[PDB]
């Protein structure tokens, strides 16, 4: 029957109780000593005869990438080591499954693979995009987040793979020696993988030695051809963003109540975020419904209004040549019980994209702007 | 005391002599006394003849030690200076010695309990639980 | 009865008492112990002669001493006495009434 697909898909939840390694993605191993070996790497876990003790992985001979090992342990093992407090029965192997996922797919395709990466020839760009900042705002460490307008990548920060970064919700600033922000802020991602191709409009894998000239003026050469041709890769998005009906060159009156936190500030301030400060600037004063602030982003932003005797109410379309408008109204170290409410005039379709694969090098680092210009925080 | 017992013994010795002599006479004399051919046995006083004149060396030998016992305690008398004023001169100290050494032990029971009583408020309230 | 107990008290008691002047005054020529006897005679005669609360009762609380009639209930004709002062104030209050009445019509602005 046709619906057996949906029947099997409905149980897309793993057992997630540990102590039984049945990933069964066509790997191979043996019991006592549950070491596994593929045409690529090898993973050896010497769990206790009743629970987990030690785990390690040897990236069987590649190439240089072997040095990139010895950090896979502190991420995989760190997901099976269970002693924050006491928890002999509650240990769901969902995170470990997710991290293990992104390696079996690469090992399943090796041909004599995880070797063709670009980060080695991409860290040059990151190292150079700081020396472009000889200007000295006297920040001492804020330039590294200021670099989130153009480019940033990393390897194995939180997950066990290569990825990138963009706008990280602060961008403008804090003694706080603890890492309380590290588990409360969300730099998003851009993942990277490889997958079989079906439509012959995409170049195969071009195994690489250089993509960029010997002097960075922003040139971009390309790899060449002919490794007994191969099958190319792909990359997903962490938190899929709904883009409007653009797809170029690959009534409602709901309301809520919240509690802001004002302590002491100027005559009257916003409620939702910080950047509404600098955008709200024609001069030092004169906020008489100027109705045209910039609010600089890869896609610009729109108007503002305020009444007098001043219970505000504002309007913000998106003048990115798509020109769709919305608006919200407002009524009134401690909560203030504001009145959030939104009403929209027109409607249209949104895409909500999560993954599209690229044919080559540049096609990924080109569209970052439009993505950045698509933040719609709307705190709830 | 010693004098008392020796005196009463010396006296009761006479009662013993009367008990001996006249009872041995009541043991009628089968002697060769000079009445006529009527052995005086009944009116002028068989009974065991073992004491008439043999008893003068049979039963009196039982009493020779009873009459020699007297000299025993004779040696036990306290013969010394009959003006015993020395002993009282040398013992009169004791009447004050015991009280002087006592004052400490008199106050002891009480005051050694009192070094505890100064604390007994707490030493007896502490049992709170 | 309740006023002839008088006799059976006065005579009976306080003649039989004075007739015990004989018991002591009898001639004495015979016996030495009958005095020890006769002591009882007088020492009871005088405690008999002390019988006077039971006469003071029937003297003071004789019948009533305070209230002597079968009390009927009738009606007096003396209400007129208060009726006079009542009628005086009755005929007098109307003066205060008319005095106040004048106050109503005392107000005048334009009418007639």
């Amino acid at each position: 029957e046709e619906v057996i697909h949906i029947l099997s898909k409905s149980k897309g939840l793993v057992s997630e109780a540990g102590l039984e390694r049945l990933a069964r993605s066509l790997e191979l191993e043996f019991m006592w000593k549950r070491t596994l070996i593929v045409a690529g790497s090898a993973l050896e876990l010497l769990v206790e005869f009743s629970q987990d003790v030690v785990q390690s992985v040897t990236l069987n001979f590649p190439d240089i990438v072997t040095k990139h090992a010895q950090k896979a342990g502190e991420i995989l093992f760190n997901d099976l080591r269970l002693a924050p407090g006491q928890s002999p029965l509650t240990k769901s192997l969902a995170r470990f499954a997710a991290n293990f996922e992104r390696l079996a797919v690469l090992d399943k395709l090796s041909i004599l693979e995880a070797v063709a990466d670009v980060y080695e020839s991409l860290a040059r760009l990151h190292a150079w995009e700081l020396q472009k900042l000889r200007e000295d705002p006297s920040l001492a460490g804020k330039d590294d987040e200021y670099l989130e307008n153009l480019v940033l990548c990393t390897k194995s920060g939180k997950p066990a793979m290569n990825d990138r970064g963009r706008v990280g919700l602060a961008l403008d600033y804090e003694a706080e020696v603890a890492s309380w922000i590290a588990d409360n802020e969300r730099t998003w991602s851009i993942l990277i993988g490889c997958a079989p191709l079906r439509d012959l409009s995409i170049n195969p894998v071009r195994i690489s030695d250089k993509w960029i000239g010997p002097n960075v003026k922003t040139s971009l050469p390309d790899g060449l051809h002919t490794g007994e041709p191969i099958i190319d890769w792909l990359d997903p998005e962490p938190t899929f963003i709904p883009a409007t009906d653009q797809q170029q060159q690959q009534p409602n009156a709901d309301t809520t109540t919240s509690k802001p936190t004002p302590n002491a500030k100027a005559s009257h301030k916003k409620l939702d975020d910080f950047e509404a400060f600098l955008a709200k600037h024609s001069s030092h004063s004169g906020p008489i419904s100027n109705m045209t602030p910039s609010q600089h982003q890869p896609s610009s932003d729109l108007s503002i209004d305020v009444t007098l005797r001043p219970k505000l109410q504002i309007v913000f379309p998106l003048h990115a040549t798509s020109k769709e408008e919305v608006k919200g109204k407002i009524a009134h170290e401690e909560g203030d019980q504001m009145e959030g409410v939104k009403t929209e005039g027109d409607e249209d379709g949104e895409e909500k994209k999560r993954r599209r694969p690229q044919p080559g090098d540049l096609a990924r680092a080109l569209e970052v702007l439009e993505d950045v210009g698509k933040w719609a925080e709307f705190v709830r | 005391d010693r004098l008392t017992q020796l005196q009463e013994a010396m006296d009761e010795l006479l009662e013993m002599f009367l008990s001996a002599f006249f009872w041995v006479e009541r043991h009628h004399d089968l002697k060769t006394f000079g009445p006529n051919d009527k052995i005086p046995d009944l009116k002028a006083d068989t009974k065991s003849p073992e004491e008439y004149k043999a008893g003068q060396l049979q039963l009196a030998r039982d009493i020779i030690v009873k009459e020699q016992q007297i000299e025993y305690l004779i040696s036990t008398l306290p013969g010394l200076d009959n003006s015993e004023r020395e002993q009282i001169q040398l013992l009169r100290e004791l009447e004050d010695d015991l009280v002087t050494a006592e004052a400490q032990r008199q106050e002891a029971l009480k005051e050694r309990d009192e070094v505890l009583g100064k604390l007994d408020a707490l030493l007896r309230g502490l049992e709170r639980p | 009865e309740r006023k002839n107990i008088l006799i059976a008290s006065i005579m009976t008691s306080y003649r039989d008492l004075i007739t015990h002047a004989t018991s002591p005054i009898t001639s004495a020529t015979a016996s030495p112990g009958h005095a020890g006897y006769s002591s009882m005679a007088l020492s009871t005669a005088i405690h008999a002669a002390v019988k006077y609360t039971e006469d003071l009762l029937s003297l003071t609380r004789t019948l009533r001493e305070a209230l002597w009639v079968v009390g009927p209930l009738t009606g007096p004709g003396e209400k007129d006495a208060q009726a006079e002062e009542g009628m005086a104030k009755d005929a007098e209050v109307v003066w205060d009434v008319l005095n106040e009445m004048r106050d109503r019509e005392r107000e005048r602005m334009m009418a007639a």
Partner: protein, 122 residues
Amino acid sequence: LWPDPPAFWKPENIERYNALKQTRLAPASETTSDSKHFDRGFELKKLAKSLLVNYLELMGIMSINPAHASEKVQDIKTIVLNFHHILNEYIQLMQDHLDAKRNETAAVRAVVDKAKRLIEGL
């Protein structure tokens, strides 16, 4: 009968008399407490016998001082009374009398020999 009393002097008016008359560390305290208690108690209870020894010394001094003389006087009275009817006839055999006189003579001699030595002091 009885000599009924001579109650001459008898009274309450007596002012003559009285008129002339106008002419984990407390173990330390526990142990020292026990020690002091025991020492004091023992010393007290023991050395009281001083009373008994003084009583004995005084009693002995008394019992020897005058009563020795009374004994020394009453002793020879018995010997003086012993010679009731004895005479030098060796009227009966009186062998019991002779042997008695010998025995009590020896006894009195021993008593006297003790007595003369007894009074060492002067």
